[PDB]
Amino acid sequence: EACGYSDRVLQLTLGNSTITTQEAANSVVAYGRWPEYLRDSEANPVDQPTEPDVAACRFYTLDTVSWTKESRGWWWKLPDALRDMGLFGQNMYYHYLGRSGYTVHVQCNASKFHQGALGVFAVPEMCLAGDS
Amino acid sequence: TNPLVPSDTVQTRHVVQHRSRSESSIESFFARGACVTIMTVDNSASTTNK
Structure with a gap:
């Protein structure tokens, strides 16, 4: 945009939290579906749901890891990675x-003299193989 | 028997119920063949004691 708006510069705000970025490559919406609450026509448990809204739908920052020449890769599971995150984790463990x-x-920032590329994948049902 | 439903004793949400009782109708409950007997016959020469 002629008023400066860029595909690379974004601000995201959820709850009391904001993320800014000046070097994005747009953003992805998985399978083109934005998150939604459960609709009545697809509902199943009949009791009144708890919807913590801003208390849980906010940005939580995990422990920072380190990328080196010997790094083979990292993985996390959701919701597991957030199980101890504020009221989201609380709401999670109080309900069936x-x-x-x-x-x-x-x-992950660096400099115009660094190089490297991380593939960041979100996998539905990311079943991993065992050691035996 | 007290005709209660969950909204009588807890807070509920609106749910659009799709489930039906089709397979437990009297007809559907019985709509199967069941073994009631096994009859034995043979094809042997009839002889004075058998």
């Missing part, structure tokens, strides 16, 4: 059932 969508923002 829960559903949730996510905004995942992976951060």
